């Protein structure tokens, strides 16, 4: 029916061993772990001289990180039986990471990992990591999460022989050289001692069988109570992982699960750590209850925030409480990531009981990071109830709460001073915010001169229009007329400067933006994205050296001296250059196919400009090579294998010149090769009608290879490849006869076809004799279409007798103009004759044999 488990239980809570071996005492005679057990950063585990056999099961994961001096993992866990894995780490239930001394695991008694995968890596001496089929250890379902890597598997593990021990998948199932691994038959699935000796299903991971014949589980599959296993906890108790406990025990049975521990709450039979969604935990933690306000929010204590590392402690806060004010005083100008960290700690904050203060912050760009603030109750306000929002001395505070974002300050006033970047008009956004609803702020509350001293305030908008766009240049036209001097005296002209000398000029920004969504500024120390033109008073600018057919972004701002407050800047806009001239085709390769064809292959790795409207191919027949007269043949015959700082600028100069001018004027006065034009389809067969002298074709933009035909045998062709693009409507009427440039440059490629299959052949050869005493003669016809000039003719002959080997003679191309004949003197007998030609392409083929009879007296 039911059985007691192995020995009396004595659980100990989640633990962690670090910095020295003596910390291992914490495991003294623990039977189980009510949480994770992690061991790490012991720089030398050798001195340890004890084991902990009584440890049998771990409710949560174990991770063994960077422990050194430990070779056999079993030295710590003699009898670790089941890894309940009730809660996983990153989805894993067992990690053995970077143990530079580990050689062996040796968990002989381990039999189940009820959840999660197993990760084992960087154990540069660990053999036998692969010698256990983990899927028979893991749960009885799909848990294919195992990952084994870099475990020194290269060659050194010669002790992989193991005692054999069971063998499967052509490898022994063994923890190490002496600890073989045993499976269970499918009749238990991991509650068995050997291949047949399996125990009650109520036990998980194994059992102990006494000499009395009784059986005891080493771990209860579902739950345990008073050392007795069963399917479910008895009523009046609450389950906590392995063992049912009383409520007064559950209240103290905490679990860590994060940098802050969570207590246990007895809830409907389960000792849950934190209440389900929408449920508050009673102040006495005796039970959970539904959220009194529907929503539940985590309270937190107010305190100074001196650095980002101090702000991260506020994660998950929703109500800030306590009489002390939340002082944001992050002096570290951490730069870009400051917003990231501050948002993480405070984005969820909703209500502040005791007002907010921002003081001496360096890199804090804006208070946007209060993404969910809705009430600064200010119950205790700052400084004797005078203030509830205290912004003072911030070098870079530029914006208060984002758009909308009501905050509804309830009590006290506000305080703003020495915020140079903060324009006063931005502070005035709070006028409808305060509960008092004042119509304006006194100088004592918001500094008239101490705020916005350097901020872009009252910006007007400039109309930027681009007149024309070229292949690599463009022009801009600031349409919004700006009255540099006072009108004197018409109206209009929204933007006006009281002094011509106070306006240095417009400055044009631009940068490459494939998406057209780049922004004017970003939270960065100094983002060098934008190219900045020099100040330009004229109002028209011409960008140069633009990469054609690329999308750009640009915007304009006025550059006034420091003391002038009138300024303006346009919205960011986009424009794209002209298609220009496309780049050259890439890796053009031409190979011969026969004496009549060529295969031309190419790709277009280099980027185009515009759209590839058409490819273009052309082949020009190069004049065939011919013999050089000074060469010789029949002495050197040819075999002839064929070839082929930020720093806002100083206005000191302008200011000083301005004042000197004022003084001087005050004192002076007183009162009383294949140009693309030819790129078109073209075909020109030779007069012989047998081959193309010039061949060209227009191809669709997806034929990466083309094949020729009707080519001349054994000749070099000047292959030619080109890419082209469509013409813009403005181009086709701006150009008349000169711009064009619609097609790319070319890389001539030379290929030589192949020699004619049957090559040079002599025909109509015949023997001859005069007056039938004179030497015999031979006459024949030169080949009709040889592979180039026949530099020499060769004739071979042999007597029709055994002894004489074949003899031959060689003659140059000369001497055949007389009758195309040749002569030789021979003795009485009968002979056989053969002839062939040889050309600058190589030896010709031999003709059929002749015969002759000779019989002078």
């Amino acid at each position: 029916p039911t059985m007691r488990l192995s020995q009396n239980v004595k659980p100990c809570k989640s633990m962690d061993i670090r910095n020295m071996v003596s910390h291992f005492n914490q495991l003294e005679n623990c039977t189980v772990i009510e949480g994770f057990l992690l061991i790490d950063l012991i720089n030398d585990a050798s001195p340890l001289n004890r084991s902990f056999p009584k440890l049998t099961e771990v409710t949560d994961y174990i991770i063994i990180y960077r422990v050194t001096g430990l070779h056999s993992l079993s030295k710590i866990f003699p009898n670790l039986s089941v890894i309940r894995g009730n809660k996983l780490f990153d989805g894993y239930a067992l990690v053995v990471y970077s143990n530079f001394d580990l050689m062996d695991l040796g968990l002989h008694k381990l039999r189940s990992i009820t959840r999660g995968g197993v990760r084992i890596e960087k154990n540069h001496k660990l053999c036998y990591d692969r010698t256990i089929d983990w899927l028979e250890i893991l749960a009885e379902n799909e848990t294919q999460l195992v990952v084994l890597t870099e475990n020194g598997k290269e060659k050194e593990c010669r002790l992989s022989k193991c005692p054999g021990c069971q063998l499967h998948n052509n490898r022994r199932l063994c923890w190490n050289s002496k600890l073989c691994q045993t499976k269970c038959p499918e009749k238990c699935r991991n509650n068995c001692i050997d291949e047949h000796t399996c125990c009650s299903q109520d036990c998980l991971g194994g059992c102990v069988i006494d000499k009395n014949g009784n059986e005891s589980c080493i771990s209860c599959r579902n739950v345990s109570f008073n050392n007795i296993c069963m399917d479910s906890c008895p009523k009046g108790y609450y389950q906590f992982d392995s063992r049912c406990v009383t409520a007064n025990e559950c209240i103290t049975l905490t679990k860590f699960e994060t940098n802050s521990v969570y207590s246990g709450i007895p809830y409907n039979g389960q000792c849950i750590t934190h209440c389900p969604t929408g449920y508050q935990k009673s102040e006495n933690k005796r039970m959970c209850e539904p959220c009194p306000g529907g929503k539940c929010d985590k309270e937190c204590s107010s305190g100074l925030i001196d650095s980002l590392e101090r702000a991260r402690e506020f994660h998950g806060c929703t109500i800030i409480t306590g009489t002390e004010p939340l002082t944001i005083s992050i002096k570290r100008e951490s730069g870009a990531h400051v917003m990231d960290e501050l948002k993480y700690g405070l984005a969820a904050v909703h209500k502040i009981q005791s007002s907010l203060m921002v003081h001496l912050t360096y890199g804090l760009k804006s208070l946007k990071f209060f993404q969910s603030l809705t009430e600064i109750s200010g119950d205790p306000p700052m400084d004797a109830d005078k203030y509830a929002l205290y912004v003072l001395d911030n070098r870079d505070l530029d914006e208060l709460w984002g758009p909308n974002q009501t905050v509804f300050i309830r009590k006290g006033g506000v305080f703003f001073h020495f915020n140079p970047k903060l324009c006063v008009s931005t502070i005035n956004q709070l006028l409808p915010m305060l509960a008092s609803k004042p119509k304006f702020f006194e100088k004592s509350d918001v500094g008239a001169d101490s705020n916005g001293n350097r901020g872009s305030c009252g910006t007007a908008v400039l109309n930027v229009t681009l007149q024309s766009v070229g292949a690599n240049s463009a022009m801009l036209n600031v349409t919004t007329k700006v009255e540099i001097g006072e009108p004197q005296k018409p109206s209009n002209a929204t933007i006006v400067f009281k002094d011509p000398r106070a306006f240095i000029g417009f400055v044009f920004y631009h940068m490459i933006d494939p998406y057209g969504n780049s922004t004017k500024s970003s939270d960065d120390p100094c983002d060098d994205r934008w190219k900045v033109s020099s100040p330009e008073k004229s109002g028209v600018m011409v960008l140069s050296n633009l990469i054609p057919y690329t999308n750009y972004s640009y915007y304009v701002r006025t550059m006034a001296i420091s003391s002038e407050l009138t300024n303006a800047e346009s919205d960011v806009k986009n424009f794209r250059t002209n298609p220009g001239r496309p780049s050259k085709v890439t890796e053009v390769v031409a190979t011969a196919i026969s004496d009549s064809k060529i295969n031309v292959t190419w790709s277009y790795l280099d980027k185009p400009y515009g759209v590839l409207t058409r490819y273009f191919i052309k082949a020009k027949l190069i004049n065939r090579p011919t013999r050089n007269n000074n060469r010789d043949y029949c002495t050197e015959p040819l075999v002839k294998a064929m070839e082929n700082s930020s720093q806002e600028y100083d206005d000191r100069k302008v200011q000083a010149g301005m004042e000197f001018e004022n003084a001087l004027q005050n004192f002076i006065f007183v009162p009383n090769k294949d140009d693309e034009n030819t790129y078109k389809d073209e075909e020109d067969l030779s007069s012989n009608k047998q081959f193309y002298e010039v061949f060209a074709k227009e191809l669709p933009p997806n034929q990466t290879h083309f094949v020729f035909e009707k080519l001349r045998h054994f000749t070099r062709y000047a292959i030619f490849v080109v890419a082209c693009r469509e013409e813009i409507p403005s181009e086709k009427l701006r150009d008349t006869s000169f711009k064009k440039s619609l097609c790319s440059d070319y890389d001539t490629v030379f290929q030589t076809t192949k020699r004619k299959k049957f090559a040079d052949i002599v025909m109509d050869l015949k023997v001859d004799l005069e007056h039938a005493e004179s030497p015999v003669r031979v006459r024949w016809t030169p080949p009709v279409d040889p592979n180039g000039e026949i530099v020499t003719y060769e004739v071979a002959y042999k007597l029709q007798k055994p002894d004489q080997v074949e003899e031959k003679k060689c003659i140059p191309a000369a001497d055949f103009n007389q009758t195309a004949g040749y002569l030789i003197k021979l003795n009485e007998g009968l002979y056989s004759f053969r002839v062939r030609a040889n050309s600058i392409a190589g030896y010709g083929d031999f003709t059929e044999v002749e015969h002759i009879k000779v019989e002078p007296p």
Binding site: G485, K489, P500, R501, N662, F669, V670, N672
Partner: peptide, 26 residues
């Protein structure tokens, strides 16, 4: 009504009275 300054003031004054300036010491 007038507000010119610097070179703008100089040119506007010159235009408003190009008939020579009274000058001093005389």
């Amino acid at each position: 009504s007038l507000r010119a300054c610097g070179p703008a003031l100089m040119d506007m004054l010159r235009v408003a009275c190009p008939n020579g300036f009274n000058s001093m010491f005389a």
